[PDB]
């Protein structure tokens, strides 16, 4: 298996109309299986175990930034195939790589090998 992308990022919880970040910082990485299916997984840094694992089909979801709450790097994953969306925050000190990771995520979820 190969990891298309991987960067330190924590997940969040959006309920009703309020977004609350999770202190359980993890790692957002993408891996393509021999089935040519891109796997979107989120591993918690607390235990280093993969807490999330779901295959993302082409154009299934969109990875974008949410410039609504100024304070840090916040991104949101929206599933075009459905109406469910997730929120994440980068843990990288510098965004010099956050932007690339963001682009790569969209490339692996919208432009798989």
């Amino acid at each position: 298996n190969k990891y298309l992308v991987e960067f330190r990022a924590g997940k969040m919880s959006l309920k009703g109309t309020t977004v609350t970040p999770d202190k359980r910082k993890g790692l957002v990485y993408i891996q393509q299986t021999d089935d040519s299916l891109i796997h979107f997984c989120w591993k918690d840094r607390t235990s280093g175990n993969v807490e999330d694992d779901l295959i993302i089909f082409p154009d299934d979801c969109e990875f974008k930034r949410v410039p609504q709450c100024p304070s840090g790097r916040v991104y949101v994953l929206k599933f075009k195939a459905g109406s469910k969306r997730l929120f994440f925050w980068m843990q990288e000190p510098k965004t010099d790589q956050d932007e690339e990771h963001c682009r790569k995520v969209n490339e692996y979820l919208n432009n798989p090998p």
Partner: peptide, 14 residues
Amino acid sequence: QEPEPPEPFEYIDD
């Protein structure tokens, strides 16, 4: 060293 986590905020599809 590492950046601190963000604080809770309201999100509205404007």
